[PDB]
Write the structure tokens for this entry.
Amino acid sequence: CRGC
Amino acid sequence: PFVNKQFNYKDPVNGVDIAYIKIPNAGQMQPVKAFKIHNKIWVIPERDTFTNPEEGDLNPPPEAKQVPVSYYDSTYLSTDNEKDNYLKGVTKLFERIYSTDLGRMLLTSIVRGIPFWGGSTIDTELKVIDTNCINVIQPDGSYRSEELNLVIIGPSADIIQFECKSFGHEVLNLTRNGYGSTQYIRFSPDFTFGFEESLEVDTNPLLGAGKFATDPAVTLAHELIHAGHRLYGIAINPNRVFKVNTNAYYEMSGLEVSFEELRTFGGHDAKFIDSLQENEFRLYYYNKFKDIASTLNKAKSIVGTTASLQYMKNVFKEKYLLSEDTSGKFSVDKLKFDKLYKMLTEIYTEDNFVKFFKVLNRKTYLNFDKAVFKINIVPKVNYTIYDGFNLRNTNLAANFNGQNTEINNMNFTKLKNFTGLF
Ligand code: NA
Ligand SMILES: [Zn+2]
């Protein structure tokens, strides 16, 4: 997941 | 090359590496056209409305209700040309990754990471777990079960929410018990994200427009790293998080980041996982590998006709690098376990891939996205296996000019700005  | 054939979406199905298939989502679905690009690895050029029956709606919720970092387009990847481009884009990224020693190492570990055959109820028989397979329609119209390790599929409703998805088990935590499971990576080579060259700007939610573009090969590699963890069943439970205390903006909102993400990014981020917890995990997974070695020692019969018990026992001896004594009893050796565990968790990291690709990239996972761009990496005049966007012998070769969206503006179309939306 890329995240914020 | 990693992908021996240059597939075209419109190539006629053959029921072998180009076929209509169904996934074990425990639900009903119309078959979708898939392409096997390498042993154990398939690509499905479709939006993912299959792995999660509750996420089969590509249409964007009410405008007055949208996640700061999200992008919707129900029409993306709905036409044959788009699917053809998606296939070629994903293929090119696998080649770019494979062209580096680190990528070759990671992809080899992934291919060898066959999900464990722990689906039997009798501890004396070795049986595969059906959700680690896909149903392939053969030339005669019948379905045949094929085991696979990885599937690259289009994103679901939120186009930029790339992630590893896999089918769980009624009792076993396949991604955390050493077993492993088939991984479905929601991913798109048609978009990328903008970040900022200055650390103080990149880690600030109020600054920057996204001058530099992330090389999509890094983004895919990031997901493949997660896949590697999950295929070897050593992913860290998402409940274990780092209560960010190194960024005032993350802090003032109590934002937490899973250890699994910090591990995957690597570099200094991996250090936020203290020694105590790090050892706890290592010991936990070491015991899990022991259970696997044990289960294999008990197995005296194999289910199915696909392969021999001898073959499968060896398949897992190699996956987990187990040891074998005089009698033929498998056991886990501490040195070999630590080496494999370390390889999967410390050698394969986003930060290390950046070093190999020689690209500019976020310096930490603890930042704030700036924007999302539409791109087209298929044409060699835009992106190559060897240089990504920074094409050699051109004005884009130096100083990451190819990733500079202001200099190489013809290769990027900003679709949405995220700065200030946080
Ligand atoms: Na995600
Ligand atoms: Zn991630």
